[model samples]
Target: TIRKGSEVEVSSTEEGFADAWFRGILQENPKLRVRYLTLLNDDALSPLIENIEPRFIRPVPPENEYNGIVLEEGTVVDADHKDGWWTGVIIKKLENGKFWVYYDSPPDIIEFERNQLRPHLRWSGWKWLRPDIQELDKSMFSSGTMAEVSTIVDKAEVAWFPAMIIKEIEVDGEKKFIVKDCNKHLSFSGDRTNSTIDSSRVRPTPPPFPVEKYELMDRVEVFRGSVWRQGLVRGVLDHNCYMVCLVVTAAAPVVKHSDLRPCKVWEDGQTPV
Candidate 1:
C-alpha cells in the first residue's frame, strides 16, 4: 500500500510491520515461545508498527576517498595507483623555498633542546626528541586547491623534524581540514557497534536540511539503519532530528540458509523439520 505525504491511520498487519516484528523476535531467539495475536485495530497496531520500516532498511556506508594529494611533509607526492582512499603523503616546496606536506593523517608533535633548536623546516620521521620543540605550518592553504591560505599562529609554531601534516587550511572562503575521510568504510571482524566518528576520527559535517518536505525523505532514508527495529519515526526522531537515522537493525549479521538440491516429497503426512 502506498503511503501519501500526509499522516493517516493504518493497520499494522496491512503494512507487514507486525510480520517484521515477529521476525525480529524470531531473530533474537528462534526457539523461544511466541503467542500469536490478532491485530485488526488500526489504533492499537499503528503505534506499534509505525516505526517498523526501519527494521528492513539497510544502510550503505559512505563511499568517498582522497583520489590524490597535493602535499605531504613538504614533499609533493601522488597516489601510486589511486586505488585506496588515501594513497599517502605528498611534500611540496613553495616558490619561496618554504616546505610543506599534505596527507589525511594528523601531524606528529615533537620536543627538542630549546638552545639547539633553530628555525628550519623539519620533516616528520618517527623518532624520539624533546617535547618542547614542535612543528608548525606557515603556508596558507585551501581545500583541494591552493588559494586564500592562512599562516599558523606563533603559539603553534616551533622547530622540529619530520613534521606532521596539519589540517588548518582555507577552502573557498571557509577554513577547515579533512579530519576524517568518509570515502573509506570501516569494518571489523566482530560487532562494531560502539565505533563512530569522534574528534579523533574526523568526518565531514552533514549538509543543511532540505527546505522542502519531499527532499527530506531521501535524506532520512540515508540513516535507516539507526531506526530499524524501533517502532515508527517518533523514536528515531527523538534521537536524530535529521531525515536520516543510522540503521542498526540491518547491521546485524545474516544467517544463510542452505539450498536443497531437489524438492523432497513428504511421506506419511509427516512434516520435515
Candidate 2:
C-alpha cells in the first residue's frame, strides 16, 4: 500500500477546521491509521489514558490482498461453529489521507495455485468524513489542587475552541495556520467516586463495544491501491482533505497492519506566510 501526500485536486475546496485537523495528522504521520479523533481535557484525560492508548498504538494489517484491497482471514473455527459468520478489520484513514488498520486475527500463511486466483480491489464502502465532535465535561472535583484545577482549565482552553490554539500567522506574503496536538488531552481519572459526573472522562470508545462473538468477525481485509492523482484544486470553498478509491480482487495479499510497517510523515508545522 502507498501512503501518499496531498496533491491538491482541482474540484476540491479548502478544508474545514475539523477536516484540517484530520488532514494535519495524516500529513504528519502517513503510517498512522486514525480510527477517530477526539478532543480531550484533564478531567477526561485519565480515562483515555487508562483505556485507549495501550490498545491503539498497536498495528494489525491483514495477510491477504484481494487485488489491492487488504483482506483479513475470517475465523474458520468460529465461522464453522456459528454455521458461517465473520467480522473483519477496521479500515481507518489518518488526517494525511493515508490508510492504517486494526485487525482481529493473528498472522498465518496459505498457499494456492497462481492461475487459480485472480485479484481486484475497490473502495466499495469508504468515505472521507469528519470525526464525531465531543465536548469536554467541566464538572469539578470536591477536593483538588487549585493548581491542578487551574491546569485542567488551561488545558480546556485550546480544546474548547480550536481557533484559540490553531491561529493564522502570516509568513512572507502568504498565510498559514498552526497545528496542535490534541491527543495529549485524551486521558481520564480513576476517581469515579468523586463528585459531579466528569463528562470529560467519557469518550466514544472504539467500535465493537461489549464485543460479542455474534457481533464480532474474526477476520477483515485491507485493500491497498494508489489514490487517483488529480490536478490540485485551490479555492475558498474547497476540501483540502484528499479522497481516493481502491482496487479489489482475490489472490491479493491480505497482510497484517503490523506486518506492513508503512511509512510515516506529517506536516512541518511551519508558519505559513
Candidate 3:
C-alpha cells in the first residue's frame, strides 16, 4: 500500500510511477520493447516526429511597380545610382525582375532592379532656338516674308512644310504670326491654327538649287549610323533638313543637309552605279 506524502514528495512519486508504467509495458511486449528502444535512441526518428504534419511557411517576395509594364530590350530608361538617377538602355531582363542596363557617359553595364528604372524623357527646348535668323535689327523678318515654316514634331505631322508669313502680332506677351501654306492656309483666327507658334519655327527661304533640289518621293543617299544608305525624302523639315525614310528598314529619321547626297542616277533596267 502507498501512503500519502508532502506536496513535493507526491509530485515526485507521480513522475516515478509514470516511468515505471512505461517500463512495465515495454517489458511485457518483447517486439515492442525492441522497436520502442530503437526509436528512443534514433536521431532520424526525432526529426521525423518533429516534422510530422508540420505547417511550413515560405517567405514573401518584394513588390515591384513596373512588373506589368512590358520592358523590352533596347528600351531607354533612367536607372538609379548612388549619385542620382542616370540615363541607361535596357540590355536584357534577368530572373527576379532584374535588368541589365548600359549607360552612355562613363560607359558602364550593370544589373538593376525594376523599381530602380523609369522611361527616359528627351528634352525639346532646343526647338526654340533660331540659329539662322538674325535679330540685330528691330525684327528678324517683316510681314509678307516668304519663309520655310515647320510645325513642332508631333503625331499628326513630323516634318516642316512651305509657308508664307502674312503678319506678326503680339499674343499673350509673345511674338506670334499668321501664315499660309501651299495646301492649306493657317491663321490666328478661331480654327485649328488659332494657337500661335514661336518665331523660331519660321525661317527665311533658302537659296533655290542644291538646297531645294531634293523633293518629297525622291530617292537620295543619307548618312546614317556611320554609313550611307539609299533613303527617300519623305518630308522636309526646312531648307537644310529632311525626313529620310530608310529603304532597308522601317526607320524614318530626320537628317541634316550635310548628311544627304544625290543618289547616282540609275538608268532604265540597269543596276545602280
Candidate 4:
C-alpha cells in the first residue's frame, strides 16, 4: 500500500535482472500503472508499466532504523535528518555501534546510530552504482592522474567519448581537469583540440571495457558520413555491430563498433574518467 504520488522501488521481473530494483511513481489510475522515474532506455520510448501488480510495489525505504547495526568504516550511507537523507561516509564506529558520518561539503560531521543510517543508493540515468561502491580513493586523484575521462563532444550526436586527462587543474577556483580526445580519426572537428570539462558532474569513472557492449534502446552516437550522429540502438546484427536509429533524421544505419559510442548521459553511471 502506497500513496498515489509517492516514490517507490519496483523489483524487476526479468530473469537475470530480477534482483534489480528500479525507481518509479504511482499514477493513481485504475490500471495501477507505474511511471518510471529511472528507465533502462534514455530515449524512453518505453516508459509505463501498465497494471503493474501490487506485490512488487513499496514505498522507497527511509534510512533504516535499528537498535544497533554494524556499518563498516568508509561505507557510503544516507543519514536520516531534517526530513531528508544526508549523504555521507562512515569514518568510524562507536562502542555503542553508532557511526561518525563525514560530509565533505562544508565539513559537517555528525554522530548517528544504526537506526539513522541506510546504505547509500540511487537509480537514475538508466544506470546504477552497486550499494557497496567504493567511493573513497577517487577523490585522492594525484597530479598526473592520467586516465580516460569522458568528454562531451557533439552531445547533440550523443558523442561523449574517451579523452585522456592531461592534468588536474582548477579554473577560477573550480576544480577541473584538462583533456585531449582520443582519435581514430579523420578530422570531424577542425581546430578543436581541447574540449569542455564538466567539473562537478565528473564521475569517479567506471572501468572501460576493452570491448564495449551496447543494448537495444541504449542511446548512442552513430558514425555515418564521417560525423557522429545522435541515436539509440534500434537493434543489433552482431555483438560488435548494431542498427542505430538516428535523431532528427528518420533513418537507421548498420554500424560496427567503430561506428558507435554509448550515449553520454548514462555513461555517468560511473564510467571512469
TM-scores of the candidates in the order shown:
0.16, 0.14, 0.25, 0.32
lDDT by residue (58-129, candidate 1, tens digit) is: 211111222222232433222211111111233443465444333443331121222211222211233212
Q: What global local distance difference test value does model 4 have?
A: 0.57
lDDT of 3 by residue, 1-273 (tens): 111121100001232222111101111111111112122355565321111110111111112432334565666665644323455567667777898665433333556787877654332222211112112112445433456555433244323445655557677788776665434434636323322457756655543236555678777766454334567889888657888986655778888887776654322332334
- Put down candidate 2 lDDT per residue, 122-232, tens digits, no spaces: 222232222222232222211110111001222231111111112223456554333222223333462111111222222211122231111112222122321111111
Backbone collision tally, model 1? 42
Residue-level lDDT for 40 in candidate 4: 39
Tell me the whole-model lDDT of each prediction, alpha carbons only: 0.25, 0.22, 0.47, 0.57
Q: What overall lDDT, based on C-alpha atoms, would model 1 receive against the true structure?
A: 0.25
lDDT of 3: 0.47
RMSD of 1: 34.1
At residue 121, what lDDT does model 2 achieve?
A: 21
- If both were scored by TM-score, which would come out higher, candidate 1 or candidate 3? 3
Worst 10 residues of 2 by lDDT: 142-151
Clashes of 3: 0
What RMSD does each model have against the real structure?
34.1, 29.7, 30.5, 22.1
Candidate 4, backbone clash total: 8
